[PDB]
Enzyme design. Structure first.
Site, PDB file in Angstrom:
ATOM      1  N   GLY A 177      44.261 -60.076  16.678  1.00 52.47           N
ATOM      2  CA  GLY A 177      43.441 -58.873  16.648  1.00 52.47           C
ATOM      3  C   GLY A 177      42.434 -58.857  17.805  1.00 52.47           C
ATOM      4  N   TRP A 178      41.156 -58.716  17.482  1.00 55.98           N
ATOM      5  CA  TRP A 178      40.104 -58.361  18.460  1.00 55.98           C
ATOM      6  C   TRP A 178      39.353 -59.596  18.955  1.00 55.98           C
ATOM      7  CZ3 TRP A 178      39.811 -54.055  21.091  1.00 55.98           C
ATOM      8  CH2 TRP A 178      40.623 -53.014  20.650  1.00 55.98           C
ATOM      9  N   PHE A 220      50.836 -49.017  19.000  1.00 56.09           N
ATOM     10  CA  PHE A 220      52.203 -48.475  19.109  1.00 56.09           C
ATOM     11  C   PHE A 220      52.723 -48.179  17.695  1.00 56.09           C
ATOM     12  CE2 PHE A 220      53.789 -50.471  23.403  1.00 56.09           C
ATOM     13  CZ  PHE A 220      52.729 -49.906  24.065  1.00 56.09           C
ATOM     14  N   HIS A 235      47.425 -55.304  27.163  1.00 49.49           N
ATOM     15  CA  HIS A 235      46.080 -55.056  26.715  1.00 49.49           C
ATOM     16  C   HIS A 235      45.899 -53.536  26.592  1.00 49.49           C
ATOM     17  CE1 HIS A 235      43.984 -59.083  28.094  1.00 49.49           C
ATOM     18  NE2 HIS A 235      45.282 -59.294  27.927  1.00 49.49           N
ATOM     19  N   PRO A 286      39.884 -62.585  20.598  1.00 48.44           N
ATOM     20  CA  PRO A 286      40.270 -63.836  19.973  1.00 48.44           C
ATOM     21  C   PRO A 286      39.338 -65.011  20.328  1.00 48.44           C
ATOM     22  CG  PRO A 286      42.229 -62.674  20.657  1.00 48.44           C
ATOM     23  CD  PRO A 286      41.042 -61.881  21.160  1.00 48.44           C
ATOM     24  N   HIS A 306      49.090 -60.596  24.782  1.00 48.90           N
ATOM     25  CA  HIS A 306      47.934 -60.754  23.926  1.00 48.90           C
ATOM     26  C   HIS A 306      47.047 -61.914  24.396  1.00 48.90           C
ATOM     27  CE1 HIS A 306      45.503 -60.887  20.336  1.00 48.90           C
ATOM     28  NE2 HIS A 306      45.906 -62.167  20.090  1.00 48.90           N
ATOM     29  N   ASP A 340      53.757 -57.650  11.438  1.00 42.49           N
ATOM     30  CA  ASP A 340      52.453 -58.292  11.632  1.00 42.49           C
ATOM     31  C   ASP A 340      52.539 -59.343  12.752  1.00 42.49           C
ATOM     32  OD1 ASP A 340      50.419 -57.205   9.811  1.00 42.49           O
ATOM     33  OD2 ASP A 340      49.734 -59.279   9.530  1.00 42.49           O
ATOM     34  N   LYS A 344      44.988 -50.471  24.501  1.00 42.09           N
ATOM     35  CA  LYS A 344      44.068 -50.287  23.386  1.00 42.09           C
ATOM     36  C   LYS A 344      44.668 -49.395  22.287  1.00 42.09           C
ATOM     37  CE  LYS A 344      39.966 -52.218  25.277  1.00 42.09           C
ATOM     38  NZ  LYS A 344      38.549 -52.009  25.613  1.00 42.09           N
ATOM     39  N   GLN A 345      45.686 -48.602  22.558  1.00 46.53           N
ATOM     40  CA  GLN A 345      46.242 -47.750  21.494  1.00 46.53           C
ATOM     41  C   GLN A 345      47.365 -48.489  20.764  1.00 46.53           C
ATOM     42  OE1 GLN A 345      47.476 -44.022  23.441  1.00 46.53           O
ATOM     43  NE2 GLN A 345      46.121 -42.991  21.988  1.00 46.53           N
TER      44      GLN A 345
HETATM   45  C1  LIG Z   1      33.901 -53.913  25.317  1.00 47.29           C
HETATM   46  C2  LIG Z   1      33.348 -55.305  25.176  1.00 47.29           C
HETATM   47  C3  LIG Z   1      34.046 -56.434  25.628  1.00 47.29           C
HETATM   48  N1  LIG Z   1      33.476 -57.670  25.460  1.00 47.29           N
HETATM   49  C4  LIG Z   1      34.136 -58.899  25.910  1.00 47.29           C
HETATM   50  C5  LIG Z   1      34.930 -59.601  24.814  1.00 47.29           C
HETATM   51  C6  LIG Z   1      36.400 -59.346  25.189  1.00 47.29           C
HETATM   52  O1  LIG Z   1      37.254 -60.438  24.757  1.00 47.29           O
HETATM   53  C7  LIG Z   1      36.314 -59.084  26.686  1.00 47.29           C
HETATM   54  C8  LIG Z   1      37.320 -58.089  27.182  1.00 47.29           C
HETATM   55  O2  LIG Z   1      37.180 -56.893  26.451  1.00 47.29           O
HETATM   56  P1  LIG Z   1      38.287 -55.723  26.615  1.00 47.29           P
HETATM   57  O3  LIG Z   1      37.773 -54.518  25.827  1.00 47.29           O
HETATM   58  O4  LIG Z   1      38.681 -55.541  28.020  1.00 47.29           O
HETATM   59  O5  LIG Z   1      39.504 -56.294  25.732  1.00 47.29           O
HETATM   60  P2  LIG Z   1      40.896 -56.993  26.141  1.00 47.29           P
HETATM   61  O6  LIG Z   1      40.737 -58.424  26.703  1.00 47.29           O
HETATM   62  O7  LIG Z   1      41.728 -56.025  27.017  1.00 47.29           O
HETATM   63  O8  LIG Z   1      41.544 -57.211  24.706  1.00 47.29           O
HETATM   64  C9  LIG Z   1      41.287 -56.397  23.564  1.00 47.29           C
HETATM   65  O9  LIG Z   1      42.143 -55.239  23.568  1.00 47.29           O
HETATM   66  C10 LIG Z   1      43.521 -55.574  23.594  1.00 47.29           C
HETATM   67  C11 LIG Z   1      44.260 -54.229  23.635  1.00 47.29           C
HETATM   68  C12 LIG Z   1      43.853 -56.406  22.375  1.00 47.29           C
HETATM   69  N2  LIG Z   1      45.256 -56.808  22.369  1.00 47.29           N
HETATM   70  C13 LIG Z   1      43.033 -57.675  22.371  1.00 47.29           C
HETATM   71  O10 LIG Z   1      43.265 -58.474  21.203  1.00 47.29           O
HETATM   72  C14 LIG Z   1      41.565 -57.231  22.344  1.00 47.29           C
HETATM   73  O11 LIG Z   1      40.725 -58.373  22.314  1.00 47.29           O
HETATM   74  O12 LIG Z   1      35.014 -58.528  26.935  1.00 47.29           O
HETATM   75  C15 LIG Z   1      32.274 -57.789  24.904  1.00 47.29           C
HETATM   76  O13 LIG Z   1      31.732 -58.983  24.757  1.00 47.29           O
HETATM   77  N3  LIG Z   1      31.565 -56.744  24.472  1.00 47.29           N
HETATM   78  C16 LIG Z   1      32.109 -55.504  24.571  1.00 47.29           C
HETATM   79  O14 LIG Z   1      31.364 -54.468  24.164  1.00 47.29           O
END
Ligand SMILES: Cc1cn([C@H]2C[C@H](O)[C@@H](COP(=O)(O)OP(=O)(O)O[C@H]3O[C@H](C)[C@@H](N)[C@H](O)[C@H]3O)O2)c(=O)[nH]c1=O
Ligand SMILES: Cc1cn([C@H]2C[C@H](O)[C@@H](COP(=O)(O)OP(=O)(O)O[C@H]3O[C@H](C)[C@@H](N)[C@H](O)[C@H]3O)O2)c(=O)[nH]c1=O
Ligand code: NA
Ligand code: NA
Lengths: 246, 246
Positions: free
Chosen positions: A108-109, A85, A80, A111, A99, A132, A82-83
């Site tokens: 992507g974002w 590669f 997870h 899921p 993922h 991809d 965020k940058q």
């Molecule tokens: C920042 C933020 C997060 N969320 C929710 C939805 C997200 O699925 C959950 C977790 O957010 P998170 O920023 O910790 O994201 P992560 O669960 O670390 O995953 C995200 O980044 C990874 C690097 C990518 N590989 C993932 O596809 C992407 O979804 O929180 C929100 O509902 N609103 C938000 O503003």
């Protein structure tokens, strides 16, 4: 291709999964020497949480950092991260992404949020990173109920990711896995697609089902995601709560 | 028409307003003797709460009870009384209703919920009861914000009702008020209209505004009001939460 990794870099912006992995690695016994370093990238996630668990900051857009990684590690995780590669990194050292979606759907974002909208399968996937659709090491689906919101599904996904990490970490470090190719193209969603979900249009015409799905997809505990505006453009944030009863 | 009421019956299924009134009456000093009895009617509200504050059960559909009321009291309040007062009662003793709506709009059931749906004014009204539209003793409007739900508006209404009770109780008991006639016909909503709001139709087509209003009107703290069903017909209850931020 075949020898045990001895120097792992974990790049992560998720403390919960980073701690889980670090504890899982401490349980392993490997025949060859093994060290893992943890690093984070993202000022706008929870960088101080990552610091607090001993990770240090890395910048993957630093071209020198990438050369150092290639010369100093034999395996890299995107846990997870965020940058992005760059090809230079993924071409030159084995990079593996963890993922929180079920590839090939809603890549992507966020899921699970898009799965609530479009009804596509979700879960977690461990896959190779290729300049991809990286080949898959393991993945597992989670159930989406009509009562679930983005948070409820997300917690299931995190739980399954942890399981996959425990199931696969030995084989990954020993480089003793076979991958499978993705069987369908599926689909991808970006951050801007999520923002568009959040910008509610009160005039928009649709089914109640469509509208409830938007709210469930954009409800994630107390996050202020979805909003409408009044005529002065004050924003009103909206969340849904759905409960089954006896 | 003119002499002080000396024997008041309060029929109420709302403990909060009954206690408030009882304490307000204890603060008054009336020249002629004055007693108030409190009674409740409704098994499906909070009858034990009413008991706990000293009220006893009355049945207004008991024709003998009505004759007793007429012979034993000189003033009767309907303070969120769930039972209908028959003509025989209202024709023969001064009966006054304390209504949590702003007459003439959204008369009947849960006025604030229908005000969220249709944007009509709401508030509280004290009016005479006559065998559709009793003349008004006093009323006051409350503001409805785009963030409000049925509960948020309801608490405003209760607050304003209390105010009206404090402002008007002396004049009412002394029978020293002039009424005004309602200036418009307005409208009425029944319980079945509310149930229809609650039975969500996922296939129904409308604006997001329409749909959000249904949810706000049917969200009232943790009440399980609005629901959709799956194909097996398990019910899923739905509530909305709306918050303004800085
Ligand atoms: C920042 C933020 C997060 N969320 C929710 C939805 C997200 O699925 C959950 C977790 O957010 P998170 O920023 O910790 O994201 P992560 O669960 O670390 O995953 C995200 O980044 C990874 C690097 C990518 N590989 C993932 O596809 C992407 O979804 O929180 C929100 O509902 N609103 C938000 O503003
Ligand atoms: C029972 C029930 C209540 N509610 C909410 C909406 C209501 O406005 C609020 C209070 O309900 P309540 O049953 O205590 O109703 P009251 O506030 O006492 O008022 C109701 O009865 C009076 C005798 C009538 N004059 C009013 O027009 C009618 O709305 O609670 C719900 O949202 N769901 C419910 O199932
Ligand atoms: Na495998
Ligand atoms: Na008056």
């Amino acid at each position: 291709l075949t020898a045990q990794a001895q120097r792992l870099l974990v790049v992560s912006d998720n403390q919960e999964l980073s701690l889980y992995l670090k504890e899982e690695l401490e349980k392993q016994s490997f025949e060859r020497p093994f060290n893992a370093d943890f690093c984070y990238t993202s000022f706008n996630t929870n960088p101080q949480q990552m610091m607090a668990m001993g990770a240090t900051k890395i910048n993957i857009k630093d071209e020198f950092t990438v050369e150092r990684i290639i010369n100093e590690y034999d395996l890299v995780f995107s846990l997870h991260c965020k940058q992005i590669f760059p090809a230079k990194l993924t071409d030159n050292v084995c990079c593996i992404n963890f993922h929180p979606g079920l590839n090939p759907y809603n890549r992507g974002w966020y899921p699970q949020a898009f799965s609530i909208i479009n009804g596509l399968p979700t879960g977690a996937t461990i896959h190779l990173m290729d300049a991809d659709h990286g080949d898959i090491i393991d993945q597992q689906e989670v159930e989406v109920k009509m009562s679930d919101t983005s948070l409820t599904v997300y917690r299931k996904v995190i739980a399954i990711e942890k399981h996959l990490i425990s199931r696969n970490i030995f084989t990954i470090i020993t480089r003793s896995y076979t991958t499978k190719k993705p069987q369908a193209e599926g689909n991808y969603n970006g951050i801007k697609d999520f923002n568009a979900l959040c910008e509610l249009d009160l005039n928009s015409i649709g089914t109640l089902d469509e509208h409830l799905k938007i709210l469930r997809a954009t409800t994630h505990g107390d996050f202020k995601n979805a909003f409408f505006c009044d005529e002065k453009g004050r924003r009103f944030f909206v969340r849904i709560v759905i409960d089954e009863a006896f």
